[PDB]
Design a protein around this ligand. Sequence first.
Ligand SMILES: Cc1cc2nc3c(=O)[nH]c(=O)nc-3n(C[C@H](O)[C@H](O)[C@H](O)COP(=O)(O)OP(=O)(O)OC[C@H]3O[C@@H](n4cnc5c(N)ncnc54)[C@H](O)[C@@H]3O)c2cc1C
Ligand SMILES: Cc1cc2nc3c(=O)[nH]c(=O)nc-3n(C[C@H](O)[C@H](O)[C@H](O)COP(=O)(O)OP(=O)(O)OC[C@H]3O[C@@H](n4cnc5c(N)ncnc54)[C@H](O)[C@@H]3O)c2cc1C
Ligand code: SF4
Ligand code: SF4
Ligand code: SF4
Ligand code: SF4
Ligand code: SF4
Ligand code: SF4
Ligand code: SF4
Ligand code: SF4
Ligand code: SF4
Ligand code: SF4
Lengths: 185, 185, 428, 428, 283, 283
Amino acid sequence: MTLLQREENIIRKGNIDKEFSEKIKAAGGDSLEYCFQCGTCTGSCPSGRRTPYRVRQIIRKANVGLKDEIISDPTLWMCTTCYSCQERCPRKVKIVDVVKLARNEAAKAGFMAPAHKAVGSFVIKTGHGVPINDATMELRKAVGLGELPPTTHQFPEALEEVQKIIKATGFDQLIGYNWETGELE
Amino acid sequence: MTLLQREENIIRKGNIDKEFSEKIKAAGGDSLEYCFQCGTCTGSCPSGRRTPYRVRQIIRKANVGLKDEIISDPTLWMCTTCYSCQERCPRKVKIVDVVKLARNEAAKAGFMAPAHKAVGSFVIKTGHGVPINDATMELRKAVGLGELPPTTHQFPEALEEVQKIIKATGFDQLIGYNWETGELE
Amino acid sequence: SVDDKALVIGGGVAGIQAALDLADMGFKTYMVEKRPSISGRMGQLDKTFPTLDCSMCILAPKMVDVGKHDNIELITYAEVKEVDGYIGNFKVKIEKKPRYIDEELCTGCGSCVEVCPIEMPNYFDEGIGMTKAVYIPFPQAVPLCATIDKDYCIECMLCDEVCERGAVKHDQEPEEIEIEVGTIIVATGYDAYDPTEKLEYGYGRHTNVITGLELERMINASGPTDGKVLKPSDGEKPKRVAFIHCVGSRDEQIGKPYCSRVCCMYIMKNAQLIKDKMPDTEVTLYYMDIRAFGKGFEEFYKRSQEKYGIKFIRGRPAEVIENPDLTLTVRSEDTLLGKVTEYDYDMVVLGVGLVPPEGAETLRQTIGLSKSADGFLMEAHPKLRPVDTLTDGVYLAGVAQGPKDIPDAVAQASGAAARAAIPMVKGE
Amino acid sequence: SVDDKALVIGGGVAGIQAALDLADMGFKTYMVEKRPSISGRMGQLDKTFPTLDCSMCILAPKMVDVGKHDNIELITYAEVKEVDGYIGNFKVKIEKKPRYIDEELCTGCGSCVEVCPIEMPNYFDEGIGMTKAVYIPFPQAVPLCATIDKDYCIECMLCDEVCERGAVKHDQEPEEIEIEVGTIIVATGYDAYDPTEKLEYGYGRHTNVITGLELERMINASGPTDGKVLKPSDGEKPKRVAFIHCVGSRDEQIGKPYCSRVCCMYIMKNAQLIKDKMPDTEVTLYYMDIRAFGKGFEEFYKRSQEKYGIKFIRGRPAEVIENPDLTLTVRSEDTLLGKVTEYDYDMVVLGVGLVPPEGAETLRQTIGLSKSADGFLMEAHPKLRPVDTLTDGVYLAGVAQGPKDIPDAVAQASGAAARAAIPMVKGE
Amino acid sequence: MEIAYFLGCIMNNRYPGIEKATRVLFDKLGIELKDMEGASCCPAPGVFGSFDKTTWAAIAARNITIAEDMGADIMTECNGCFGSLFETNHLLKEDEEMKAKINEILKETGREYKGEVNVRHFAEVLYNDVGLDKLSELVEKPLNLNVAVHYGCHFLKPSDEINIDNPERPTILDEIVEVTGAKSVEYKDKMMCCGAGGGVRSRDLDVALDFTREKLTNMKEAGVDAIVNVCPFCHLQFDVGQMEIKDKFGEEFDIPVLHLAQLLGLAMGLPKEDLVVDAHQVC
Amino acid sequence: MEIAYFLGCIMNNRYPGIEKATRVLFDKLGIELKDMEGASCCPAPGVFGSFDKTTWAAIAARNITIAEDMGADIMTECNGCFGSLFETNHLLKEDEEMKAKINEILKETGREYKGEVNVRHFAEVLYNDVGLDKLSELVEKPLNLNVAVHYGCHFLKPSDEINIDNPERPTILDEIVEVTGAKSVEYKDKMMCCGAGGGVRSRDLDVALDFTREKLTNMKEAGVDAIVNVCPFCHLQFDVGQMEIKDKFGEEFDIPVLHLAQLLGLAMGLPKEDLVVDAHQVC
Ligand SMILES: Cc1cc2nc3c(=O)[nH]c(=O)nc-3n(C[C@H](O)[C@H](O)[C@H](O)COP(=O)(O)OP(=O)(O)OC[C@H]3O[C@@H](n4cnc5c(N)ncnc54)[C@H](O)[C@@H]3O)c2cc1C
Ligand SMILES: Cc1cc2nc3c(=O)[nH]c(=O)nc-3n(C[C@H](O)[C@H](O)[C@H](O)COP(=O)(O)OP(=O)(O)OC[C@H]3O[C@@H](n4cnc5c(N)ncnc54)[C@H](O)[C@@H]3O)c2cc1C
Ligand code: SF4
Ligand code: SF4
Ligand code: SF4
Ligand code: SF4
Ligand code: SF4
Ligand code: SF4
Ligand code: SF4
Ligand code: SF4
Ligand code: SF4
Ligand code: SF4
């Protein structure tokens, strides 16, 4: 197989979105402007040790403005938000905030895993990311707790309020939730 | 598809062959000891612009001793030996010599392309990397030159001398040339 | 027996400080400067790192002090021709070049400049500024006196007829001065590296490639552009500027294996000043190491990023290509992204290093001093005698001893004053 | 009226140079040093970059000169308690701590040291060397006199019985000295950053993690290991050594945003010295920028690679893990390979930075000086008055004004001598 | 003392033993746990924070307004829920424009965030409001257990905002654990993440399980008897992921996973039935 | 004078017009070209140098001994062959151990390398031994042609060893070309490699063709009429690769490729048949 690849091995202005960098900085990632690429973050990163995820390089790309490279990157979703890097960064960059903002842009670009959308749909339907099941219902009953916890599981009005918030923020549209059928699109 | 890869995303002593670095340095690549990774070589490299080949990183790996990573790397064969990097290196590293020594080690490890073996076999059979064909015999005849050039094509004894050199250096065994059959295997 | 007089060679900040320290200590001091005015390179700067304070505002008072000090004999536009003898007993022969202007009569009014019809380059503007065949290098010059360059004068006599002090003397001749001194302080400074030989960067061929010192002159409000950073090609502001570090330094391909030690800082300073003047300008630096080692320097670096949004690319550029529209493409690896980049810019500034000045070898041989491996003057001991030389009675001050910034040079000049005063105080 | 006497506070290379320059200029000079002997940190070093020349070999003659100079009164083991007045009219109150040894009678023979039964740490060995409750910090000490530490003395009187000069005085009391001077030169130096708070690097918990200054003592032939670099855990040579740059510097997580300016060079120097002593040792440096900015420094860096085969990894280590066998794994990205590395080492050396010395605030308030952002003393003007302070008659010299190497400190000390001599020469 | 009690999802819906042990413990301590009626997912920061900051913040603000209406501070037993709610609280308190946006969203529900209550972690409440002495008094049977304490990440980090203990080398959980007679055993990479945060468990199960496998190997070489955590998210990762690791790679560590509340209840002589170990996949 | 004539492979076996033009030109100049009977592949540095240094050096040393027997310097008009032979010569001359090893290998052939002759490039010989004035004299018809000069990498590099001209901005070939009346047109990335060196043409044809396509685009935007080279390897890359590019991507550059010898013959009024343009794939 040839190794020729004329766009993946060079960076020109056509790969750069300056408005993306400005949007990230204005939304709370402004500190990314001033890391000096020491690599402490990558050294601290537990996901970097077992995947191709390189947090230092994500910060670098965000500064350069390589939007398409960042948001389409699967490795972006390898960060557990353990904050170890952010605890150690000598320039006090808010790394985790930058990662989450990049993830928000990626989600807006359609790079959402089906499982994450399933969690979103569970929250829409029941108000819980991890809804209760029958076995836990009976187990709660056994130890004298209520069959249902005093949560959106018990109060339909609370679920209605949560669903109103989700509609108002557009989150249902972000994950392609269909209200009529209660399924994902 | 999982991104998990336990061995490809971390460097430990198990990935390092120090004897390899010593062998490279003793064979004429000793200057690789002192580049300070400025990246001038990569910037000058025409193959680096269109393939994943990164000459600076090859030099770095040679210094670290990542033998298995270097010799098995297909990108190692993307260098045309244009010498532009070597002309510009601020530390006067003999980059092309390092690349060729790494290639010799790779060939010894069995990473030889079939086409390169074909060139070797052409030299073994005829003494020319690009042997003459019928049409060129006709043109040579028509333009007043001899039908055959005064080379190993004309003189069998010269071809036998070349083949003796090839046997003495073991090159026939390097490319798997079988003398009885005249084939590669 | 030790003569209680001193000679200071060079009229930069180092020489100025040494002379003022010696004079304030009571010793009679000669100062020989080859240019028509003292100031050296500091007077050419617009601002100084790391404070961004104006250089002329703080240098000019010292120059005035030198020009009016009772214990200082200032001989500008002159050069040391011979040195004989030893410590306490130096006989020095100086040649005052002819100004063709009477230093005692000239007031520096500038009328002769206004009337002269011949234009010529101003050395103070480093090749990007013009003046007349009769000129005053800059308004704060000390002495504030005119000079006529005979390689450009056509002997029109308009300056002669316009002057009211009768200061123009077309028949002036070079003057020989002989002095006796007990000590000598060499403070001859440096020259900016000329990058023409760096063919891949294209200086002298590409229109919009300039040096850092040229940029200093262009930023300076009293410079030839009235402080505006303008593209040489069209005279408009550059929307995109690249700076390249280590030009002429840390490079064995040109036999310059040393670090020029100030380039990183003045690069960042000029970038900050450009951003201050033109906040919309995009500025990018190609570096290998950021050497922000001085007091406040690391903070200056952080501020370059946090406050001004200056972009830093770790990569020594391979090439600068001029496009048909005269924009410039810098081809360089970003070693931290690990990828080749080809970025476009409207102007490229080469961070040229520091080299010994023109004529350094001649003066070194005249005095009889030794030079270090980097071509600058060698001190007696690199750890404990940084301003002494193995030639007793001769001391070093400022960049003459090697590249360094203003406070380090000033400290060296004060130290050399002390070390020279010691033998003169002893008297033998 | 300006008193023609000077006070120099601190007995390091900067203070020594300032005092000798003032004395050679004829001014009577007091020197006050809190340790029992002068030398400062320079006397602790084994060799000096970039020449690898012996530090003590060149420092000791100057210390002797200070101890025998007619114009210098040396008051060691003493501290400035009060300062009143102004330029030319300073009244200073000094407290000479009790040695419990008579400086005039003690010859420094060392018999009392041999006979003492109580062991205690030697401050000169930076926490890795032992001596007795009665001690001489190092054989080249000036004055060459003993000192008894009463926190460890058990009053056994063996030292009294063994001494022949009758120099032991267990009944000695602190002595109050009052002096009048016209100028003051603060040359109080620095302390090595203590990295205990850098929990991820494990200093003070991991057995085989040491600082650069500790390594200086271990390398030194007169040190507590007879110049052998030995693992603290087992007393054997380390086959693999890592150096970590910028420890305590360039780090906002600990409020140290400045570059300590010397750690890159002394790191490379000690790596070269280790290789020289043990050519088979593997040595690796984790750095961010190599700041080899000085004369010959870039060449020193190249030589570290070409001659000695020292490995350079561009990456600020995330963590140092102690293994069960007490080897150390450094976890760090190699930013130029773009990959995480976990490399094993037998010893790890932290390149600690420079900080103001213990008690700096008290003396600063006693004199009344201002401090810069980095915690060191502030000069009157960062470009043109590097050794002056806004307090007239008080000057700065050496690392007191900020981190810097020996030649720069020596130049500053000479300059401060000049600047202080000027008012004293004027006399008013 | 009174405190609003936030449950989250995993504890109330997968491991009710943790909730029961907590309720009994706080009843023994004289602290009134007041239910947060109508509470929902906090929501989990890993997914919602990664997808849309505004939705995450609005849901968390509604959860906070429940306690504000009740007029009490919030107590959370989950690192994940604590991180979500605490972050939302301090973000809305320190930023007026975002508070206005969130309240504009909340106006449809008839609620309004006021910034009147604090969010507190279960361990912090135990350590500060109760103290180690009172906890030691309530112990009925010292435990002979070698435990590996898993702090998790969002208990203490970001430390600049949370300011509970030193993230690199904390001791608070270790001290609470040793109050029970159990020994907290040091092990390699003790502060490492369990791999479940940031949505990684659902996005790439193999990567998260690799985190867990590394941690379990380090705990096993330290010879511990159980894992102690203060996070039902981490609790689920360890418990279910031990089964997943056993089924995937054939490696079984069989190390029990206990929430800190369950450990305290065991030391305090709680009924075995109240500790719902039937919910745990690891026996 | 007299000089040994090394042919290589590509010139004598694919483009004999280059050889015929060279022979006629040198006959007109009073320089005796002496055949190197029994010569083989130089051998091509890209493959043999990459595979085994010893084999490459031994074969090159045998080629050099062929000329040493005649007591004449070697002249090559191929950048590749010049690089191979010149490098081998200066390696064996400057290293005694390697010379001993190579001669030990050569014992079988009955030859011995002595280090007695020099290796010289065709252009260097023309520029220095003949000079521009004599070449200008031999011109019979000035050419009205816009030419793109392709230096090729191994003519001048490594410059430390070769020391013929400045590799970044050379002029020697341009001056020789303009002696014929043709105009050397500057074009972007003029010094760039053609992509065929180092074995790349045979290993990854697409990459080498991408080099050639970039170069051809830059030449076309400069409006040149032909390419002039001093390397049959470069000649073949440009000629055959224009056809390969047309077949693969449909790009049609249609720029003739001429060796410098052929250009000089054209300016010198040599017969058209002697140029043997029938060998060129590009018309
Ligand atoms: C672009 C640039 C920006 C800089 N910015 C800063 C900055 O912001 N801050 C900072 O601290 N430093 C800065 N520097 C460094 C600073 O310029 C030097 O530290 C300082 O100028 C050295 O002064 P000097 O007196 O030693 O030498 P110079 O300034 O070179 O003065 C030497 C003098 O000697 C004269 N002379 C030379 N040869 C002879 C001779 N043979 N006979 C008589 N006279 C002679 C010269 O004409 C001149 O008047 C910068 C340097 C450059 C190139
Ligand atoms: C590990 C290491 C290696 C180094 N290696 C080199 C090298 O190779 N080359 C080089 O050039 N530089 C080197 N340096 C830098 C060098 O140590 C300093 O530049 C130099 O020591 C500064 O000397 P100083 O006199 O200013 O201060 P110091 O050496 O610190 O001396 C100050 C003196 O003042 C005394 N003092 C302090 N406070 C008081 C007080 N209140 N009253 C009285 N006395 C007081 C101290 O006890 C001491 O005697 C190194 C530094 C370190 C940490
Ligand atoms: S640790 Fe901080 S300064 Fe260093 S590379 Fe990461 S984000 Fe940048
Ligand atoms: S927060 Fe994300 S990038 Fe930072 S150390 Fe944890 S997993 Fe790595
Ligand atoms: S140009 Fe030279 S010094 Fe720079 S990275 Fe390449 S080989 Fe190393
Ligand atoms: S010689 Fe190889 S690595 Fe160097 S510039 Fe040419 S192709 Fe790139
Ligand atoms: S020469 Fe005359 S006109 Fe010119 S500046 Fe001097 S005084 Fe003025
Ligand atoms: S005489 Fe010379 S200097 Fe005077 S005005 Fe004429 S040209 Fe100018
Ligand atoms: S000071 Fe900076 S730019 Fe100048 S030579 Fe040194 S590293 Fe390069
Ligand atoms: S106290 Fe006495 S024994 Fe001890 S060093 Fe002094 S003179 Fe010698
Ligand atoms: S009296 Fe004190 S100093 Fe003297 S020997 Fe006894 S313990 Fe040591
Ligand atoms: S001198 Fe070097 S090691 Fe020290 S703080 Fe500066 S960059 Fe770091």
